[PDB]
């Protein structure tokens, strides 16, 4: 039984994949006049570059629906129009654009700009930080080449690829490259004859 934490990947049914960056308490969350605190706070900067107006339309339709007890339709090339959900919002006493007067929870003072609140259908993805967390000690090595194994289920270590070697060369760190690729990976002591080679 797992609880959402830092590192869990979340989707918002619009290709806006995200990772939980911080878990703030309830009192730190901003609150409206009715006292509702948001569960998920998403960055607005993701909207202009991606032009996800459909997300805003879905939010508005969902807010109107949860206000009037209906299920609006987001059918392709159709569905409920913006005018209908705006009328549903203005009828219930809320703003016709979703933006509501919100007071900051931290300072206790109202915000200079209204906040876009609304119910969004967020879906959690199978990509978890707990399953993806990996750390490699000395551990086991392969029989053929005495190097760490490949995968995490095999208790493997991370590989310094060719491009990483190129970057280390460009930096000029000869000792670090030597320690990584020789000392810490496949160091060995052989016996060579100086006569025959």
């Amino acid at each position: 039984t797992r609880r959402p934490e830092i590192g869990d990947k979340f989707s918002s049914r619009h290709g806006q994949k995200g990772v939980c960056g911080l878990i703030v308490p309830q009192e730190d969350m901003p609150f409206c006049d009715s006292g509702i605190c948001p569960d998920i706070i998403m960055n607005p900067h993701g909207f202009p570059s991606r032009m996800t107006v459909g997300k805003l339309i879905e939010l508005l339709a969902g807010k109107a629906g949860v206000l009037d007890g209906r299920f609006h339709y987001g059918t392709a090339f159709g569905g409920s129009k913006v005018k209908d959900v705006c009328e549903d919002l203005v009828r219930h006493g809320y703003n016709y654009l979703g933006k509501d007067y919100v007071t900051s929870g931290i300072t206790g003072e109202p915000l200079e700009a209204y906040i876009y609140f609304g119910p969004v259908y967020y879906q959690k993805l199978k990509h978890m930080v707990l399953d993806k967390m990996h750390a490699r000690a000395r551990g086991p090595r392969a029989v053929l080449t005495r190097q760490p194994t490949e995968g995490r289920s095999r208790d493997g270590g991370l590989r310094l690829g060719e491009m990483e070697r190129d970057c280390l060369i460009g930096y000029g760190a000869s000792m670090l490259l030597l320690e990584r690729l020789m000392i810490s990976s496949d160091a060995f002591e052989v016996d060579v004859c100086g006569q025959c080679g």
């Binding site: 490699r136 000690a137 551990g139 490949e150 590989r159 990483e164 070697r165 690729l181 990976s185």
Partner: protein
């Protein structure tokens, strides 16, 4: 996957970890946050001196 490209030029090493990243502005640009779990696994050999 040959010896030169898979075992000589680029090979696997230990004392390393892989984890998903998350933002944290309260840290300096030259600092990185490491989980306690990975920190207990990745060890550093320190020589005893005076």
């Amino acid at each position: 996957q040959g010896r030169f490209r898979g075992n000589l030029s680029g090979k696997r090493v230990d004392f390393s970890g892989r984890t998903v990243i998350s933002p944290d502005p309260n840290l300096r640009i030259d600092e990185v946050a490491v989980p306690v779990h990975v920190a207990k696994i990745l060890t550093f050999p320190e020589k005893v001196n005076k």
